[PDB]
């Protein structure tokens, strides 16, 4: 019993984190095989950051301008290139702790673990969702750039996020490991803002299924609904649309708990219209949307890595 | 910016997790240097569950009755002893991934990370607090026994919890790494029930300081309180007493934000009276009590 916000074990990724220094800037890099990945903004001064020409800044740098430390050991940088908004430093040694891995780009609604790091040293692990507005609600201080996000699918680490910056509202923006931003952001010091966010409907339903599995049942009711009727309600309350694919994905949980997805949608409709009337679900007074259907099944079934 | 329930990176503990089998029972063990630690209830049978005599069950075992698997490798058990409610299996290999570590017994209100494990393999990491009633609100399935709780301030792992059992209310009980239970619990299937649980007041105050640090002041008020009047009110909402020690511990956060501890207590009193009126604090619609003052300073700097 119990249901907690749970991250993947972080050990396989811890063994890949390094410190990258360029001039007066220190941040984190990811060392896989013989390449260190980090944000390209490491090469900017403050003035450059206002309007950077990355190609022009980079051509002025030599390999020896990049100081890379893996724990207490310097790595030798033997090459440097850029891919979108990530810098790739070729080093002279393959990381002996490189896990089986892939680079994947995730979709809004999908969750991942973030290993927060400072000076190449992991400090904390937590679970995040990619918001519909392509931000994450992380917890990061100065020095955290280059921290990474990941899932583990078997013994394979899927790296999906590298941290680049904090937005004025205190939410976070970054790239996939091929250097493409999530969301309409750029790596420059200019006015940028998170768009208005929405709630991830399919995940709220997953979490209601988690609640039922753990014996929290007060919100269930006799009623069902249609996708179209529910979607009119979702739209009114700034919930993402529920699609038939979402319904299909929740199929297992529906069969296990005896609550059809549209039956659970009628529960959610009532919660949106009426509130919780002083009650909690899994210890929360808000509807939680950072567990995917996969997360719920994994945690309710004890899958290991 | 931001504020998240954040665990320690689990790698140093992952490298210590093994599978322990005795008879038909399999659970997790912790391999440090040449000793594997696990719950002594691994030696109980189905018969034994209510009133096991562990000394009598143990004397009947040989080293070779304990199967210890570290990844794909069997370890050889070369000795065994019981300390309180933990079994210590001496093995013929020192774990080459042993971190710097210590064993610490914690007090209610303290937080730690839990590495949930099944069959000696890590499943997930999350943050927990030792509740005032000496339980933890974990996430554990059958087979999770022997999972551990830890902090890693510095590069040294402080092991503070080993998981033993789930109580009927669905909360969790366990021991320190010297095998002494937290709270009045025993490793028997006899009827036992946790005390009524209460809110960890000092932690809620810490978390209100966190909200201020992160730019939120809506819940402050112009009032102050005496410590005794605060406690008289808070006990009515099932809050733990705040002690002068707790007031002292909040001093740094008070100095950082400019809000006196008893002024923050007055804010909390009003929140208990009023609720949040549709607002949130650090993304929550309830008052959060699983962040310590130390946790807040670590995360917020
Ligand atoms: O974003 C931050 N620092 C930055 C941004 C940039 C540039 C790089 C491209 C555009 C912006 N450089 N350094 C930041 C600030 C405060 C804080 F608490 C946390 C962070 N952080 O990192 O998440
Ligand atoms: O408590 C559980 N299993 C136990 C208890 C014992 C007793 C034998 C005498 C003292 C210990 N053995 N195995 C348990 C059961 C269901 C569940 F979802 C989770 C757990 N758990 O562990 O957290
Ligand atoms: Na219903």
JSON list of N, CA and C and ligand atoms in Angstrom, two decimals, chain A residues 221-224 263-264 266-267, ligand 3:
[
{"chain": "A", "resi": 221, "resn": "UNK", "atom": "N", "xyz": [-19.09, 7.27, -8.39]},
{"chain": "A", "resi": 221, "resn": "UNK", "atom": "CA", "xyz": [-20.51, 7.54, -8.46]},
{"chain": "A", "resi": 221, "resn": "UNK", "atom": "C", "xyz": [-21.12, 6.58, -9.47]},
{"chain": "A", "resi": 222, "resn": "UNK", "atom": "N", "xyz": [-22.45, 6.62, -9.58]},
{"chain": "A", "resi": 222, "resn": "UNK", "atom": "CA", "xyz": [-23.16, 5.65, -10.41]},
{"chain": "A", "resi": 222, "resn": "UNK", "atom": "C", "xyz": [-23.15, 6.04, -11.89]},
{"chain": "A", "resi": 223, "resn": "UNK", "atom": "N", "xyz": [-22.66, 7.23, -12.22]},
{"chain": "A", "resi": 223, "resn": "UNK", "atom": "CA", "xyz": [-22.90, 7.84, -13.53]},
{"chain": "A", "resi": 223, "resn": "UNK", "atom": "C", "xyz": [-21.76, 7.57, -14.51]},
{"chain": "A", "resi": 224, "resn": "UNK", "atom": "N", "xyz": [-22.09, 7.67, -15.80]},
{"chain": "A", "resi": 224, "resn": "UNK", "atom": "CA", "xyz": [-21.07, 7.64, -16.84]},
{"chain": "A", "resi": 224, "resn": "UNK", "atom": "C", "xyz": [-21.29, 8.82, -17.77]},
{"chain": "A", "resi": 263, "resn": "UNK", "atom": "N", "xyz": [-16.89, 6.24, -16.89]},
{"chain": "A", "resi": 263, "resn": "UNK", "atom": "CA", "xyz": [-17.40, 6.22, -15.51]},
{"chain": "A", "resi": 263, "resn": "UNK", "atom": "C", "xyz": [-16.49, 7.08, -14.62]},
{"chain": "A", "resi": 264, "resn": "UNK", "atom": "N", "xyz": [-15.16, 6.92, -14.79]},
{"chain": "A", "resi": 264, "resn": "UNK", "atom": "CA", "xyz": [-14.24, 7.73, -14.01]},
{"chain": "A", "resi": 264, "resn": "UNK", "atom": "C", "xyz": [-14.30, 9.18, -14.47]},
{"chain": "A", "resi": 266, "resn": "UNK", "atom": "N", "xyz": [-17.00, 10.70, -15.29]},
{"chain": "A", "resi": 266, "resn": "UNK", "atom": "CA", "xyz": [-18.13, 11.30, -14.60]},
{"chain": "A", "resi": 266, "resn": "UNK", "atom": "C", "xyz": [-17.74, 11.65, -13.16]},
{"chain": "A", "resi": 267, "resn": "UNK", "atom": "N", "xyz": [-16.86, 10.86, -12.53]},
{"chain": "A", "resi": 267, "resn": "UNK", "atom": "CA", "xyz": [-16.31, 11.25, -11.23]},
{"chain": "A", "resi": 267, "resn": "UNK", "atom": "C", "xyz": [-15.56, 12.58, -11.33]},
{"chain": "C", "resi": 3, "resn": "LIG", "atom": "NA1", "xyz": [-19.25, 7.16, -12.29]}
]
